[PDB]
């Protein structure tokens with residue numbers, strides 16, 4: 001108790017050189033008083049928000065979407081000048097497919113209220129970043145908000161049932177094997193394998209299910225749309241539902257070799 | 258001795274209302290002043306409309322130190338946790354969080370400087386605005402995003418946002434946000450009719466289907482992790498991910514998940530999901546899963 005108080009007074013004195021023969025307790029109390037009198041404003045809070053979540057404040061009009069205030073922070077989050085944002089509407093700074101959603105969030109027909117949504121805003125052939133906007137409405141009708149950026153071939157991956165049927169295949173297949181994804185789905189992978197290698201493939205599948213979780217590996221000749229035998233390495237592991245441990249499917253990464 | 262009045266003037270000079278500052282014991286004033294000084298030090302490091310910035314936030318800002326001291330918390334924290342700024346500033350973060358998370362917090366304070374995680378903090382506020390005390394406390398999942406930086410040692414500046422409870426909704430939901438209900442294995446069991454217009458699925462055909470089959474494989478690493486978090490802490494926010502659309506292509510989604518329990522036997526019943534559609538159907542020509550082809 002008394003030790004905590006002494007450590008408190010000392011750590012107070014610790015960081016302040018002005019008072020640091022260390023004096024009477026009352027004098028360091030009035031000392032901290034006088035040092036604080038020389039000294040929480042908004043610019044530090046702005047930098048705290050920009051540090052924590054890379055966010056910037058903006059006030060727009062609820063009716064015409066013309067922004068009435070953008071903070072400087074708009075420049076590091078979107079590489080967009082302040083002069084751009086000021087004098088325009090949010091509809092111009094938002095992905096065209098996102099205007100209707102904007103329209104509702106800026107609507108005053110439904111409801112001091114609070115807003116929270118996601119959209120895509122263009123940054124400095126265009127490019128859009130996902131921005132989470134949280135804010136409320138203010139008569140000034142206007143929307144006060146903070147928009148923040150969270151921001152946190154030679155192969156193709158496929159999903160299979162434990163039998164070996166393609167239940168999922170990514171587009172990269174068309175470049176590696178030459179098939180459109182539709183010609184692979186619903187068919188067993190051993191259908192596309194050289195018969196001489198087929199058994200091997202099947203064995204590997206039996207092994208990925210017996211040895212759950214562990215990634216297994218097999219190399220075989222895959223038939224392409226051009227009917228050429230292409231050697232390929234497939235690394236396969238079963239994926240389990242993290243709650244029930246049920247095998248959802250088997251993930252394979254088929255890599256040209 | 259008038260040291261009591263010296264403390265009075267210390268608290269008045271402290272940056273907060275007089276009604277809060279004067280109802281303060283000695284050690285509490287010492288704590289507050291020390292933390293304000295250390296926060297000012299780090300702020301000099303980093304920097305070299307307050308009510309608007311504060312009330313426009315869906316969370317609270319906190320700068321914690323390497324030893325776990327919460328040397329600064331913003332005023333709005335009460336609005337979210339009940340515990341107030343003066344009650345928490347200066348105390349260790351481990352004295353307020355779920356112990357089963359502590360190690361994870363311990364691993365985000367250490368040492369790339371970007372941090373993004375979920376923790377459980379004490380909460381004495383209820384959905385009615387009424388506030389209970391420390392002995393009767395509910396765990397509240399916070400999504401914390403921030404940066405760890407070094408000053409002259411280390412500290413962690415993080416925004417912590419709560420994840421809304423789908424039952425206790427206080428904000429408007431737009432045309433392209435819809436609700437979904439799952440068992441705890443994430444198997445679909447209820448979905449909103451908006452999914453027919455948004456992704457093309459009719460609610461009925463999804464019933465009983467595993468959601469693990471309906472997301473682009475490239476996102477698996479995220480999704481499972483979220484599931485795991487959802488099952489260890491009861492609430493989670495996913496990253497941006499791709500859900501395959503009915504007739505080919507996919508659509509971009511971000512969804513919050515909450516484990517909801519039966520009030521009568523207190524067991525977890527199922528999972529709610531507030532899904533934010535973030536785009537239209539992209540690459541609608543390409544099919545990726547068997548559920549799309551059988552739909553041609």
Ligand SMILES: O=S1(=O)N=C(Nc2ccccc2N2CCCC2)c2ccc(Cl)cc21
Nearest residue numbers: 437468471472480481484495500512514532
């Ligand atoms: O693309 S899904 O089929 N997968 C979904 N969720 C999911 C799948 C596998 C693991 C974890 C999760 N999550 C846990 C909470 C956030 C998401 C989901 C949710 C809602 C809709 Cl409408 C569609 C889908």
